């Protein structure tokens, strides 16, 4: 028997390691989704209120201070798109892990039945 | 009596809950989105109820009680339809556990219905 690699011991391990793998990331893959949904919402209505006072509540009342709120939902605008495409990229780097994950397992599972059937044959050798 | 199927007869199963599991996941990602988007207008419509309780100043207050009630509305509205996605969320996940335990179990009875198909091959 020419053994490639390791036992069948070495790879139930590995299948438990990575399956640990797995829940942990779409766990958290479950809640960037959750707050990539947050901050869509709050980006959607800081537009649409950025809209609804713009060209002179909602009513136009003192322009003197209507463009200092202007630039406070411009940076509350802008920083919550920074944030969303962090998190959109984090979202996407887990749907990567998960897939190198995905394959690994695909991988490994038949090659259990293989470590399993060269044990079964050093076992009828002793 | 051989088990009451054929390999070609659950290869074939395990690609409709393979099928299966993918246009749910596909529907519960996009539910625990649109949960959130609920979850953060909720937070905003109680923050801005309780903002006006405390421009935003105070004007008008016979105009502005129906304000809360369209706040109210608004906000009611909005909890009646994050509750049937949250149920909804579940019952996704439900299934989805009942299909890894299909998959889980018919996968060994696959690798079975095929050893006796192999057993056979030597009879004939
Ligand atoms: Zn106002």
């Not at 909602?58 to 919550?80: A, F, I, M, P, V």
């Not at 959109?88 to 887990?94: A, F, N, P, T, V």
């Amino acid at each position: 028997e020419k053994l490639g690699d390791k036992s069948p011991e070495d790879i139930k391990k590995l299948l438990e390691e990575l399956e640990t793998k797995k829940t942990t990331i779409e766990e958290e893959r479950n809640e960037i989704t959750q707050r990539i949904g947050e901050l869509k919402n709050k980006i959607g209505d800081l537009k649409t209120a950025i809209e609804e006072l713009k060209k002179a509540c909602g009513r136009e009342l003192t322009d003197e201070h209507r463009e200092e709120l202007l630039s406070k939902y411009h940076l509350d605008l802008n920083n919550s798109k920074n944030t969303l495409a962090k998190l959109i990229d984090r979202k996407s780097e887990l749907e990567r892990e998960l897939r190198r994950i995905d394959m690994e397992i695909k991988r490994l599972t038949p090659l259990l039945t293989v470590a399993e059937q060269i044990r079964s044959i050093e076992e009828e050798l002793n």
